[PDB]
Amino acid sequence: DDKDCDEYCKKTKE
C-alpha cells in the first residue's frame, strides 16, 4: 500500500 506512493514518487521524480 504505502509502497504505491513511493513507487509513484519514483515515476514522477525519475
Q: How far is the CB of 5 from another protein (least distance, A)?
A: 4
Query: C-beta of 11: minimal distance to another protein in Å?
Result: 10
Question: What's the one-letter identity of residue 5?
Answer: C
Three-state secondary structure of 1-14: CHHHHHHHHHHHHC
Scanning residues 1 to 14, which ones bind another protein (CB under 8 A)? 1-2, 4-6, 8-10, 12-13
Please report, as ranges, the residues that interact with another protein according to CB under 8 A: 1-2, 4-6, 8-10, 12-13
